[PDB]
Amino acid sequence: PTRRLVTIKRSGVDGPHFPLSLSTCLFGRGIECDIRIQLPVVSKQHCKIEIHEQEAILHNFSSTNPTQVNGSVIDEPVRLKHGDVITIIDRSFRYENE
Amino acid sequence: VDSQGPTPVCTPTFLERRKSQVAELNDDDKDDEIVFKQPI
């Protein structure tokens, strides 16, 4: 896989990594989600990523708690760039491109 | 909480509890609260 995602812990230490091998990565409480979090403050889809030969696009489905990127909310769709970090409440995922 | 229940917005109380919880936790965090659907 070219795209790799690293999990950030509440303590600020990186742990297990998630390879975005699949063309779609969905974060949330829903099981159908590629990444599931057992937090009651997490939306069913929270964040959705779509990977196109062109580039990687992150969609914000969290209407209750918007996803933050580079320390900023993404009310609208945003193209992912190598080095861009997705931040969820107290948890964030570092995006690495190849 | 069911993956099909309510979704309360994260507030100052929730964030403070997590920070406290981290202090109450240790290297045992290893088993945080994130689950990977696909293999890693």
CATH number at A87 reads 2.60.200.20
Percent helix, strand and coil across chain A, each to the nearest 5: 0, 50, 50
Domain count for chain A: 1
Phi and psi dihedrals of A18, rounded to 5? -120, 110
A3: its two tokens: 């795209």
Q: Which helix (H) or strand (E) holds A93?
A: strand A91-97
The CA distance from B25 to the nearest CA of chain A, in Å, is 9
Q: Residue B34: which of A7, A19, A41 has the nearest Cβ? A: A7
State the residue range of the domain holding A74. 1-98
B27: its two tokens: 């290297």
Strand order in the sheet with A3-8: A14-19, A3-8, A91-97, A85-88, A68-69, A72-73
A22 with A41: CB under 8 angstroms? Answer: no
CB contact under 8 A, A65 and B32: no
* E strands present in A33-90: 35-37, 47-51, 56-60, 68-69, 72-73, 78-80, 85-88
Q: Which residue of B has its CA nearest to A65?
A: B9
- Per DSSP, the three-state class of A18 is strand
The CA distance from B32 to the nearest CA of chain A, in Å, is 7
Give the bridge partners for A92, in sequence order: A87
CA–CA separation, A19 and B2 (whole Å): 27
